Amino acid sequence: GQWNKPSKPKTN
């Protein structure tokens, strides 16, 4: 139950 489940939208 976190952020976007390693599907990083801009890869950081």
Partner RNA sequence: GGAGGAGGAGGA
Residues in the site for RNA, rule: CB under 7 A? 1-3, 5-6, 8-12
For the bound state, the minimum distance from the C-beta of residue 2 to RNA, rounded and expressed in Å, comes to: 4
- Closest separation in Å from C-beta 9 to RNA: 6
Type of residue at 11 = T
Q: Minimum CB separation from RNA for residue 4, in Å?
A: 7
- For Cα atoms 7, 10, 12, give the angle at the middle one, nearest 5 degrees: 95
